[PDB]
Design a protein around this ligand. Sequence first.
Ligand SMILES: [Cl-]
Ligand SMILES: [Cl-]
Lengths: 404, 405
Amino acid sequence: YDVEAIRRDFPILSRQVHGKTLVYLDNGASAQKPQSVIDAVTHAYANEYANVHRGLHFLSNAATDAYEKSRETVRRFLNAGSVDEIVFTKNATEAINTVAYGYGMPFIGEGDEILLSIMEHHSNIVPWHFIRERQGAKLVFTPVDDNGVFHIEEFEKRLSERTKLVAITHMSNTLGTVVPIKKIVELAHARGIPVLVDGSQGAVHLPVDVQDLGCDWYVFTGHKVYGPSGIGVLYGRAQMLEKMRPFQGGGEMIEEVTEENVTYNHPPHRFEAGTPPIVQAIGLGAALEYMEKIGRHAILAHEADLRDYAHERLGRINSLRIFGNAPDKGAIISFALEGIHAHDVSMVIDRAGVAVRAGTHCAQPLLKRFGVTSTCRASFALYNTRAEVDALAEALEKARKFFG
Amino acid sequence: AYDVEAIRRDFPILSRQVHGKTLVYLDNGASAQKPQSVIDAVTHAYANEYANVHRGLHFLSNAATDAYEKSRETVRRFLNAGSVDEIVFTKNATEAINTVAYGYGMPFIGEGDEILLSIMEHHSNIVPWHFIRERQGAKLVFTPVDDNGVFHIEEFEKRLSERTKLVAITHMSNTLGTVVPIKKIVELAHARGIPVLVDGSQGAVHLPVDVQDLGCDWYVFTGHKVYGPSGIGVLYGRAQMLEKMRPFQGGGEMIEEVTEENVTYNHPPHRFEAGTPPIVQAIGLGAALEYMEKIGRHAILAHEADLRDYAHERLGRINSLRIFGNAPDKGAIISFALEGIHAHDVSMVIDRAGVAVRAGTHCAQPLLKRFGVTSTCRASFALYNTRAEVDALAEALEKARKFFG
Ligand SMILES: [Cl-]
Ligand SMILES: [Cl-]
């Protein structure tokens, strides 16, 4: 694992911040981009740009190819059966809404249950809440223990004849806890219940095989996988996509439009209304290829080393608490210093060059359950180093002395 | 004073070859090419100033939030909206229209209520309203246009009634190029308490737009057509009308409080921007709208008017050729057919000569059906196009006619 060589692919990592060395550990919110992604975006706009309704003319063709090729890269990256199971969206949030409006709304009604975890990011909560609020569905929350460990027996107890959908995270964006999703799908499918998986973090930090998982839907977001902003992905099993009605309506998702009626395309196009994020899809392709080039398991090993080393180093800091200590967790470390506000810690180490995030992390119910309103989060990526963990630890010790 | 050769030098793609031949890109109505400044702004954002934008405390989150909030201000100025809080960023114009259709239309339009459109509407300004017809029993009504493509206000006015709950209408037809008299339409609608959505996906590219002088309740446009990034749209809505709308997409950044038991929502515009938005695309859009300001919106209008008139003269001289839409104030969008030849044939063939046009429905089937065709060719002009390109189009079309004849 040549991390120094890897870092050289990311131009931003060498810039200064307040005249100081950048140490970017807010990857969970958004990740930095390798040169190849930037080059792919630039080349698309500069040399191969047009709209993609596979037009007859050269550029429309070249752009449709580049676009369809991304769709294939995503398919391979997730190990989906077919490219027709990959739907492009604005972001993961929109992917989840597509399912919530397309499937959930027609099929989930008064008294029916939607089963989530307490770890869900808001985007895997609010769309389901719409069904509660508008149609009288109930939300149920699978708990997690004080160590952040997820217990399958606790999920299983909350499955019932009224459960119509399971929507659950692959990896917690706060605890880093990895959810045993294959086992969850097995249990759900045995009862005929479909499962959506929020893989916005999972996809960044774990090998993902959506056929081995068996999940009905899997979503992830481009900007976290080292890729462009403005691009998300919804994977859905063909039969499940097919049963969904349209979410957004317009050009490119119809078959026939007359004054009197409209008929709809089949997936994935059924769910991609108007001009899609063309160049962002292409850039995402380049980003997923970048991850393949390094090797997904090499990444996992490297991030596991950063996780363990971070737990050791921060563990040595007197007043510091880590939220989430699952053995197989991703390299996402949420923490607090006793008697100091997270925003204080964060502002201050930013001055040393260290970028962390403080606040809710779009997961308030999780924080309420853990007895806090705010935490700091250092989230690691494939380009981060042990020396950066040390810089974090040094800065946090300094922050503790400053406010203490 | 319009230096088109200098302007063209800002767009790197325009100098490239296609099938060993000079590119003549006339499919701008589908999507426009990008000036270097837009590409530079995108590159710089990713390379040097990238982070998420929940105004984080840390340097990069700050720099990116600034750049992002600055784009929002550029859009506001470009549209002449009252306030930045009236600008909602979306994936594209299509999504902007759906945000209204789901946020306003669905709660407020029911069985028997009427939604008033034009026959010229792009599918994206039809299908979202059809959902209300299909799911809640609303009726769609279509304002016609005459054979020359001219829109007649008296025809819109007759179709207004006590049952009309919303008007959704295009600013400029993506096929005919017809400009709709939107100020007058809003006047008539508002006199009855009826809100108006305007589809400005072409209008914004080709006309000066002042949404306060128009008075429209909503105005949408799309980034990729205004010389900007893909993956970015805009919804403008009068504050009071945005406020009335329930949330469309749900998730991070559009909530106030989330508990297990309930969720409360932000106010506009954030109420309507769920999850990470198209950050760098918004920034790139800003650069694109500044580009248009630099050239001058009225200088553009004069130049595109010259291209329109010259194209009508030149193509008019071609024996078997019919132009669909001849309104006197039309935008520089020319839809046409050659008698006895399929549009796909014409299009594939002139592409070999280097000329890029589009054949097909143009996402406007009802309009084509009302004009008696299934398919047309469309040559759509932009600020960087020239008279010589009109000639190239005309020469290629004459050649195509002889080839298939
Ligand atoms: Cl705090
Ligand atoms: Cl045809």
